A paper describes a structure:
ATP synthases use a transmembrane electrochemical proton motive force (pmf) to generate adenosine triphosphate (ATP) from adenosine diphosphate (ADP) and inorganic phosphate (Pi). ATP synthases are macromolecular machines consisting of an ATP-hydrolysis-driven F1 motor and a proton-translocation-driven FO motor. The F1 and FO motors oppose each other’s action on a shared rotor subcomplex and are held stationary relative to each other by a peripheral stalk. In Saccharomyces cerevisiae, the FO region contains subunits a, e, f, g, i/j, k, 8, part of subunit b, and the c10-ring of the rotor, while the F1 region includes a trimer of catalytic subunit αβ pairs and subunits γ, δ, and ε from the rotor.
To test the hypothesis that the peripheral stalk of ATP synthase deforms under strain, we next added ATP to the preparation and froze cryoEM specimens. Subclassification of these populations separated each catalytic and each binding state into conformations with increasing rotation of the rotor relative to subunit a, and increasingly strained peripheral stalks, designated as ‘a’, ‘b’, ‘c’, etc. Overall, 27 unique conformations were identified: State 1binding(a to d), State 1catalytic(a to h), State 2binding(a to b), State 2catalytic(a to e), State 3binding(a to c), and State 3catalytic(a to e). This observation shows that, other than being in a catalytic or binding dwell conformation, the differences between the structures are mostly due to deformation of the peripheral stalk subunits and the rotation of the c-ring relative to subunit a in FO.
Author numbering:
A (entry chain V): 117 to 173
B (entry chain Z): 1 to 48
C (entry chain U): 54 to 105
D (entry chain Y): 1 to 37
E (entry chain T): 26 to 249
F (entry chain 6), K (entry chain 3): 2 to 75
G (entry chain 7): 1 to 73
H (entry chain 8), I (entry chain 5), J (entry chain 4): 1 to 75
The structure:
């Protein structure tokens, strides 16, 4: 747990990072993106529930 | 009126339809899934 | 004739630099901030759990 | 960033593309007919 | 080649730049420039989810996105003072419209058989006026064929033509003796107001095309 | 050349048909704003209904415009 | 010759004017639909068939004008 | 000669104008139907035959215009 | 000849008549906006975009007429 | 010549007709302004700038029409 | 000769534009009377706005009229 805290201390993006690095550490990223393109969706469920939905009307 | 008639119609339409098919594929395979990468990455951060 | 169109376009860019460029700066900034804050909040959220 | 993710909806856009070919051909003939006017 | 061909190339390269190098460091927070193409993404997600339901809306989401973006970009580029129109070449816009109308009709026939023709009885009515309501439904269905294109084409063309005619007129207005060149700015300002309007109706038309052919796809996907 | 003159006249007359549709379009949208302001919540159902109505009203105007073009091109 | 062919084109132009009435008519039906539905809420499903019928009849007047244009052409 | 043929066509075109008022009229009767049914919730059974009656009478005016248009057109 | 150049000018004049319907139309949308906003107060967040949309389309009908006027006159 | 010069004046006269619609348009906007303000006593601070937009836009249709009248008249 | 005749005819046609303003003024004044009769007391604020509206409505008719004089004299 000391190590886990330390692991979070020396790496923690919230400044900016490549989307490639999040893809690299979690290939779950590419799995979900591919599954959504395959499914015929372009809505990411939950994205709109804590990020905007940028529309006026 | 003849002013809205060029005879270059087929020239216009050829380059025109080439641009549409190009933009359609370009969005569909590349740039639309590249936005979906931002969204999905944001949601994974949301989970963690 | 066609130089009039260029003068109006220059005037249009004048309105843009007056009104739109700071507004769009503020708009872009606002959204970017909100995203950043959500992301950092989630990072915070898991750090708390480790401590628990 | 840019990575190709297959969109299998390019083959769902088959009725659109068939229509496109017909109009493309038809405008060739229309251009030839209008240049004889 | 042709002037038209040269500006179609410019459109392709502009659209490429909006995703290729909008970001610096491929941000997870999103660049300030990329906020624009996020808002566009979200309002068209919510627009074609707004019209067509199912998970089938995402199946037509690129089609509605490139019909948005083409018209959105081509009603900014075509408004540049010396840039050579692609939208005032109506033959490209109208041909695309006829293509989409046929590609809706073919899709509807393919997906929904000869009960596609149930689209043209859109309500139970007295039996002697069941056929009347087929005739003037089919009439209105290929009025949709030309309406979608011709609306956009006329607006953009009219904008350029209005602006150029008044520009040519205001040159000779300033040529009138100098007491007329005092208050020679008031027509120049009018041309500016018109140029502003052409952008407005150009962004609105990009939405109007894409909502109307979202409505037409709603009709095509779900009968009636 | 009387025919050519006349073609230009017939076309001019054709614009008159468009005026009615121009008003019509505004009336549909007026109704939209009115309905929505009265109900609030009706808007999500009504906005699609409105878009359909816009197209139908527009189509009459399209016919008037098309006849103008038919004359214009001859 | 010249006068008769000329007259056909002119007469056709006049016929378009008749369509305008239908254009206004159709708008009135849809306006009424929106007003009725916003007033009631729940009426809409009953009203929508009535509206389609009313739309058709309004359009029909314009159609008569349109076919007369075709006769002149 | 030419003038007489021309005149027949002109008169036909002019007559087409008459129909427009009937067009607007038909809509007005139906607008009232919609508003009435939404107003009452229940007027519809009495009012629907009334609406048809009003429609028919309004329509008939346009029909008269139309037959005169044909009469001038064909001679 | 004299007649043809004249006919361009005359035909254009007639074409300009079409614009009046759009002009009144635009005002009707803005009236509805003002009425709506005063009626609800707070509807405006949805409705102001709707009204601008309605403005545009009313205007567009006018532009069709305008472009035809130019087409006859200027060629 | 005489016919072409004549056609400038006649064509201009016909063109002047379109202006009436913009006049009515402005009246509708101001009527709505009054109507809204009388309901609320207090909508006005929002509604007055909205009304100026409506005025300008309706007026613009008139100015386009007036331009065409001048193009026919003056050349 | 024909040019003189044409300008008199054209002057007539242009006068029709005034028609809209004559209606227009009344629509503003009607709303004034309706508003003040509704409120009993809006009038102090509303009356300036109403006079602004009157002037503008009339002004469009005056554009028609100055064109009418440009035809009539010219």
């Amino acid at each position: 747990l000391q190590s886990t805290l330390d692991n979070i201390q020396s790496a923690r993006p919230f400044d900016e990072l490549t989307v490639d690095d999040l893809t690299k550490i979690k290939p779950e990223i590419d799995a979900k993106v591919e599954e959504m393109v395959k499914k015929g969706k372009w809505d990411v469920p939950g994205y709109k529930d804590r990020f905007g939905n940028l529309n006026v009307m | 009126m003849p002013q809205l008639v060029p005879f270059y119609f087929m020239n216009q339409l050829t380059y025109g339809f080439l641009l549409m098919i190009t933009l359609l594929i370009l969005f569909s395979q590349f740039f639309l899934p590249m936005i979906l990468r931002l969204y999905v990455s944001r949601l994974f951060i949301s989970k963690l | 004739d066609e130089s009039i169109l260029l003068l109006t376009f220059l005037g249009f860019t004048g309105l843009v630099a007056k009104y739109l460029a700071p507004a769009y700066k503020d708009f872009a900034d606002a959204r970017m901030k909100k995203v950043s804050d959500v992301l950092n909040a989630s990072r915070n959220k898991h750090v708390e759990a480790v401590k628990d | 960033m840019l990575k190709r993710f297959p969109t299998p909806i390019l083959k769902v856009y088959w009725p659109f593309f068939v229509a496109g070919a017909a109009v493309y051909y038809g405008m060739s003939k229309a251009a030839d007919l209008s240049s004889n006017t | 080649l042709t002037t038209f061909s040269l500006y179609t190339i410019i459109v392709l390269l502009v659209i490429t730049s909006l995703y290729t190098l909008t970001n610096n460091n491929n941000k997870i927070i999103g660049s300030r420039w990329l906020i624009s193409q996020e808002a566009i993404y979200d309002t068209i997600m919510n627009m074609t989810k707004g019209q067509i339901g199912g998970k089938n809306w995402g199946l037509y989401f690129p089609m509605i996105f490139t019909l948005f973006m083409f018209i959105f970009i081509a009603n900014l580029i075509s408004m540049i003072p010396y840039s050579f129109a692609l939208s005032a070449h109506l033959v490209f816009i109208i041909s695309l419209s006829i293509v989409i109308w046929l590609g809706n009709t073919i899709l509807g026939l393919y997906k929904h058989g000869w009960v596609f023709f149930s689209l043209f009885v859109p309500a139970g009515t007295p039996l002697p006026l069941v056929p009347l309501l087929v005739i003037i439904e089919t009439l209105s269905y290929f009025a949709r064929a030309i309406s979608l294109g011709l609306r956009l084409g006329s607006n953009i063309l009219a904008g350029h033509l209005l602006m150029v005619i008044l520009a040519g007129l205001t040159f000779n207005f300033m040529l009138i003796n100098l007491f007329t060149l005092v208050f020679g700015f008031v027509p120049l300002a009018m041309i500016l107001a018109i140029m502003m309007l052409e952008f407005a109706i150009g962004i609105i038309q990009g939405y109007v095309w894409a909502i109307l052919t979202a409505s037409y796809l709603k009709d095509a996907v779900y009968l009636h | 050349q009387l025919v050519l003159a006349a073609k230009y006249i017939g076309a001019g007359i054709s614009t008159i048909g468009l005026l009615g549709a121009g008003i019509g379009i505004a009336i549909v949208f007026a109704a939209l704003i009115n309905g929505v302001s009265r109900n609030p919540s009706i808007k999500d159902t009504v906005f699609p209904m409105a878009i359909l109505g816009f197209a139908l009203s527009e189509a009459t105007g399209l016919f008037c415009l098309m006849v103008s073009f038919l004359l214009l091109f001859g």
